[PDB]
Protein backbone atom coordinates (compact mmCIF):
# COMPACT_ATOMS: atom_id res chain seq x y z
CA UNK A 1 0.00 0.00 0.00
CA UNK A 2 1.28 3.42 -1.07
CA UNK A 3 0.19 6.60 0.70
CA UNK A 4 -1.96 4.58 3.11
CA UNK A 5 -2.08 4.55 6.93
CA UNK A 6 -1.83 1.99 9.72
CA UNK A 7 -5.07 0.03 10.10
CA UNK A 8 -6.78 0.16 13.51
CA UNK A 9 -6.94 -3.10 15.49
CA UNK A 10 -9.78 -5.24 14.17
CA UNK A 11 -10.38 -2.98 11.16
CA UNK A 12 -10.31 -5.83 8.62
CA UNK A 13 -11.21 -9.03 10.45
CA UNK A 14 -11.32 -10.82 7.08
CA UNK A 15 -7.80 -9.86 5.88
CA UNK A 16 -5.62 -12.97 5.42
CA UNK A 17 -1.89 -13.43 4.82
CA UNK A 18 -0.68 -15.92 2.22
CA UNK A 19 2.54 -17.25 3.69
CA UNK A 20 5.03 -19.79 2.40
CA UNK A 21 6.96 -22.23 4.53
CA UNK A 22 10.33 -22.37 2.78
CA UNK A 23 11.55 -19.72 2.61
CA UNK A 24 9.12 -18.26 5.16
CA UNK A 25 7.84 -15.16 3.36
CA UNK A 26 4.69 -13.24 2.49
CA UNK A 27 3.04 -14.36 -0.73
CA UNK A 28 -0.10 -12.21 -0.87
CA UNK A 29 -3.20 -10.91 0.87
CA UNK A 30 -6.55 -12.69 0.77
CA UNK A 31 -9.89 -12.67 2.54
CA UNK A 32 -12.03 -14.83 4.79
CA UNK A 33 -15.50 -15.36 3.30
CA UNK A 34 -16.53 -18.21 5.61
CA UNK A 35 -15.12 -20.46 8.35
CA UNK A 36 -13.56 -22.69 5.70
CA UNK A 37 -13.07 -20.52 2.57
CA UNK A 38 -10.47 -17.97 1.59
CA UNK A 39 -10.59 -15.83 -1.56
CA UNK A 40 -7.43 -14.66 -3.33
CA UNK A 41 -6.13 -13.72 -6.80
CA UNK A 42 -5.11 -16.64 -9.02
CA UNK A 43 -1.79 -15.03 -9.97
CA UNK A 44 -0.71 -15.49 -6.31
CA UNK A 45 -0.61 -19.24 -6.86
CA UNK A 46 -0.12 -19.54 -10.63
CA UNK A 47 1.98 -17.49 -13.02
CA UNK A 48 4.00 -19.52 -15.52
CA UNK A 49 5.81 -16.63 -17.17
CA UNK A 50 7.55 -16.31 -13.80
CA UNK A 51 7.58 -20.04 -12.97
CA UNK A 52 5.15 -19.50 -10.06
CA UNK A 53 2.85 -22.47 -9.33
CA UNK A 54 2.00 -23.15 -5.69
CA UNK A 55 0.32 -26.28 -4.40
CA UNK A 56 -1.45 -26.54 -1.05
CA UNK A 57 1.59 -28.12 0.60
CA UNK A 58 3.48 -24.95 -0.28
CA UNK A 59 1.44 -22.47 1.74
CA UNK A 60 -0.10 -21.54 5.05
CA UNK A 61 -2.86 -19.02 5.78
CA UNK A 62 -2.51 -16.55 8.66
CA UNK A 63 -5.74 -14.97 9.87
CA UNK A 64 -6.36 -12.22 12.43
CA UNK A 65 -2.94 -10.67 11.89
CA UNK A 66 -1.97 -7.04 12.44
CA UNK A 67 1.81 -7.28 12.61
CA UNK A 68 3.43 -8.38 9.36
CA UNK A 69 6.39 -10.38 10.69
CA UNK A 70 5.32 -11.09 14.25
CA UNK A 71 3.86 -14.43 15.27
CA UNK A 72 0.88 -12.92 17.14
CA UNK A 73 0.72 -15.50 19.89
CA UNK A 74 -2.87 -15.72 21.19
CA UNK A 75 -4.35 -13.71 18.34
CA UNK A 76 -3.63 -15.13 14.90
CA UNK A 77 -4.71 -18.55 13.64
CA UNK A 78 -2.60 -20.39 11.04
CA UNK A 79 -4.31 -22.87 8.72
CA UNK A 80 -3.13 -25.54 6.31
CA UNK A 81 -4.82 -25.79 2.90
CA UNK A 82 -6.90 -28.80 1.87
CA UNK A 83 -7.33 -27.86 -1.79
CA UNK A 84 -6.94 -24.85 -4.11
CA UNK A 85 -9.37 -23.95 -6.92
CA UNK A 86 -8.24 -21.59 -9.71
CA UNK A 87 -10.83 -20.21 -12.19
CA UNK A 88 -10.65 -22.48 -15.23
CA UNK A 89 -10.62 -19.49 -17.58
CA UNK A 90 -8.04 -17.44 -15.71
CA UNK A 91 -6.10 -15.73 -18.49
CA UNK A 92 -2.50 -15.57 -17.35
CA UNK A 93 -1.43 -15.53 -21.01
CA UNK A 94 -2.72 -12.02 -21.67
CA UNK A 95 -4.43 -9.71 -19.19
CA UNK A 96 -5.03 -11.72 -16.01
CA UNK A 97 -8.69 -11.96 -16.97
CA UNK A 98 -10.55 -13.79 -14.18
CA UNK A 99 -7.82 -13.43 -11.55
CA UNK A 100 -9.48 -15.27 -8.69
CA UNK A 101 -9.11 -18.54 -6.77
CA UNK A 102 -10.83 -20.20 -3.80
CA UNK A 103 -8.86 -21.87 -1.00
CA UNK A 104 -10.32 -24.56 1.26
CA UNK A 105 -8.89 -24.70 4.80
CA UNK A 106 -8.30 -28.19 6.24
CA UNK A 107 -10.43 -27.24 9.25
CA UNK A 108 -12.87 -24.39 9.89
CA UNK A 109 -11.48 -21.55 12.03
CA UNK A 110 -13.34 -20.01 14.97
CA UNK A 111 -14.28 -16.34 14.81
CA UNK A 112 -13.11 -13.79 17.36
CA UNK A 113 -12.68 -10.04 17.73
CA UNK A 114 -9.90 -10.27 15.17
CA UNK A 115 -11.29 -12.93 12.80
CA UNK A 116 -14.56 -12.42 10.92
CA UNK A 117 -15.79 -13.06 7.36
CA UNK A 118 -16.59 -10.38 4.79
CA UNK A 119 -19.86 -10.50 2.80
CA UNK A 120 -19.97 -11.45 -0.89
CA UNK A 121 -22.06 -9.00 -2.92
CA UNK A 122 -25.53 -9.55 -4.33
CA UNK A 123 -26.81 -8.12 -7.62
CA UNK A 124 -28.47 -5.06 -6.10
CA UNK A 125 -25.52 -4.32 -3.83
CA UNK A 126 -23.09 -4.44 -6.75
CA UNK A 127 -25.50 -2.24 -8.68
CA UNK A 128 -25.76 0.47 -6.04
CA UNK A 129 -22.11 0.56 -5.12
CA UNK A 130 -19.86 -0.06 -8.11
CA UNK A 131 -20.13 3.56 -9.33
CA UNK A 132 -17.33 5.92 -10.44
CA UNK A 133 -16.75 8.40 -7.62
CA UNK A 134 -17.48 5.87 -4.90
CA UNK A 135 -14.63 5.02 -2.57
CA UNK A 136 -13.69 1.49 -1.59
CA UNK A 137 -10.87 0.30 0.67
CA UNK A 138 -7.78 -1.83 0.08
CA UNK A 139 -5.58 -3.27 2.82
CA UNK A 140 -2.26 -5.10 2.81
CA UNK A 141 1.27 -5.56 4.06
CA UNK A 142 2.72 -4.90 0.58
CA UNK A 143 5.43 -2.46 -0.42
CA UNK A 144 5.21 1.14 0.75
CA UNK A 145 6.87 2.58 -2.37
CA UNK A 146 7.12 1.39 -5.97
CA UNK A 147 9.97 -0.37 2.23
CA UNK A 148 7.65 -2.73 4.11
CA UNK A 149 5.45 -1.62 7.01
CA UNK A 150 5.36 -3.29 10.41
CA UNK A 151 1.57 -3.12 10.45
CA UNK A 152 -1.34 -3.64 8.03
CA UNK A 153 -1.91 -0.55 5.91
CA UNK A 154 -5.16 0.91 4.59
CA UNK A 155 -6.19 3.36 1.87
CA UNK A 156 -9.61 4.38 0.49
CA UNK A 157 -9.81 4.91 -3.31
CA UNK A 158 -12.49 6.06 -5.74
CA UNK A 159 -13.91 3.81 -8.48
CA UNK A 160 -12.76 5.18 -11.86
CA UNK A 161 -14.83 5.40 -15.02
CA UNK A 162 -14.28 2.49 -17.41
CA UNK A 163 -13.05 4.66 -20.30
CA UNK A 164 -10.42 6.44 -18.20
CA UNK A 165 -9.30 2.97 -17.08
CA UNK A 166 -8.91 1.84 -20.68
CA UNK A 167 -7.01 4.98 -21.72
CA UNK A 168 -4.39 4.60 -18.96
CA UNK A 169 -3.00 1.26 -20.17
CA UNK A 170 -1.95 -0.63 -23.27
CA UNK A 171 -3.39 -3.75 -21.66
CA UNK A 172 -6.70 -5.21 -22.80
CA UNK A 173 -9.29 -4.48 -20.08
CA UNK A 174 -12.39 -6.70 -19.62
CA UNK A 175 -15.71 -6.68 -17.82
CA UNK A 176 -14.16 -8.92 -15.15
CA UNK A 177 -12.07 -5.96 -14.00
CA UNK A 178 -12.47 -2.42 -12.68
CA UNK A 179 -9.79 0.21 -11.87
CA UNK A 180 -9.57 2.47 -8.82
CA UNK A 181 -7.44 5.37 -7.69
CA UNK A 182 -7.23 9.14 -7.87
CA UNK A 183 -6.66 11.08 -11.10
CA UNK A 184 -3.73 13.48 -11.49
CA UNK A 185 -6.02 16.44 -10.83
CA UNK A 186 -7.37 15.34 -7.43
CA UNK A 187 -4.40 16.02 -5.18
CA UNK A 188 -4.84 12.87 -3.08
CA UNK A 189 -2.88 9.70 -3.88
CA UNK A 190 -2.56 6.01 -3.09
CA UNK A 191 -2.56 2.49 -4.49
CA UNK A 192 -1.89 -1.16 -3.73
CA UNK A 193 1.62 -2.39 -4.65
CA UNK A 194 3.59 -5.63 -4.72
CA UNK A 195 2.73 -7.87 -1.78
CA UNK A 196 -0.86 -6.57 -1.82
CA UNK A 197 -2.16 -8.98 -4.50
CA UNK A 198 -5.14 -11.11 -3.51
CA UNK A 199 -6.20 -8.55 -0.91
CA UNK A 200 -9.68 -7.09 -0.70
CA UNK A 201 -11.29 -3.98 -2.13
CA UNK A 202 -14.31 -3.52 0.17
CA UNK A 203 -17.26 -1.13 0.36
CA UNK A 204 -19.60 -0.48 3.31
CA UNK A 205 -23.27 -0.79 2.38
CA UNK A 206 -25.12 2.34 3.47
CA UNK A 207 -28.28 0.18 3.32
CA UNK A 208 -27.45 -2.46 5.93
CA UNK A 209 -24.13 -1.26 7.46
CA UNK A 210 -22.30 -4.37 6.19
CA UNK A 211 -18.90 -4.73 4.51
CA UNK A 212 -18.92 -6.33 1.05
CA UNK A 213 -15.88 -7.46 -0.95
CA UNK A 214 -16.20 -5.77 -4.33
CA UNK A 215 -12.76 -6.52 -5.82
CA UNK A 216 -9.46 -8.34 -5.38
CA UNK A 217 -6.11 -6.57 -5.98
CA UNK A 218 -5.11 -7.79 -9.41
CA UNK A 219 -2.57 -5.78 -11.43
CA UNK A 220 -1.22 -2.30 -12.11
CA UNK A 221 1.87 -0.86 -13.83
CA UNK A 222 4.03 0.34 -10.96
CA UNK A 223 2.57 1.81 -7.73
CA UNK A 224 0.85 5.17 -7.31
CA UNK A 225 2.06 6.37 -10.72
CA UNK A 226 0.31 9.53 -11.95
CA UNK A 227 -2.21 8.81 -14.71
CA UNK A 228 -2.10 5.10 -13.79
CA UNK A 229 -4.69 3.00 -11.93
CA UNK A 230 -4.73 -0.24 -9.95
CA UNK A 231 -6.85 -3.03 -11.44
CA UNK A 232 -9.17 -5.33 -9.50
CA UNK A 233 -11.14 -8.52 -10.16
CA UNK A 234 -14.88 -7.79 -10.27
CA UNK A 235 -16.10 -10.25 -7.65
CA UNK A 236 -19.81 -10.07 -8.40
CA UNK A 237 -19.14 -11.04 -12.02
CA UNK A 238 -17.38 -14.21 -10.83
CA UNK A 239 -19.95 -14.91 -8.12
CA UNK A 240 -21.55 -17.82 -10.00
CA UNK A 241 -18.18 -19.55 -10.26
CA UNK A 242 -17.73 -18.96 -6.54
CA UNK A 243 -21.22 -20.20 -5.59
CA UNK A 244 -20.45 -23.07 -7.94
CA UNK A 245 -17.31 -24.41 -6.26
CA UNK A 246 -18.67 -24.00 -2.73
CA UNK A 247 -21.85 -26.00 -3.34
CA UNK A 248 -19.81 -28.50 -5.33
CA UNK A 249 -17.21 -29.01 -2.63
Amino acid sequence: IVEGSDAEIGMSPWQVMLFRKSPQELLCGASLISDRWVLTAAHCLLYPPWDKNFTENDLLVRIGKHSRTRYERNIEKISMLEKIYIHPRYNWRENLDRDIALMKLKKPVAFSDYIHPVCLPDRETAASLLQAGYKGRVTGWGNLKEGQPSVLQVVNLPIVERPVCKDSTRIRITDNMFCAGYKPDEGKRGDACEGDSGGPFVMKSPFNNRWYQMGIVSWGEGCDRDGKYGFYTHVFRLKKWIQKVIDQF
Binding site: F19, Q24, E25, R68, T69, R70, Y71, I78, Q148
Partner: peptide, 7 residues
Amino acid sequence: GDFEEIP
Protein backbone atom coordinates in the same frame (compact mmCIF):
# COMPACT_ATOMS: atom_id res chain seq x y z
CA GLY B 1 12.90 -13.71 6.66
CA ASP B 2 12.20 -10.37 8.33
CA PHE B 3 9.76 -12.84 9.91
CA GLU B 4 9.45 -14.28 13.39
CA GLU B 5 9.48 -18.10 13.48
CA ILE B 6 6.08 -19.77 13.58
CA PRO B 7 5.47 -22.59 16.04
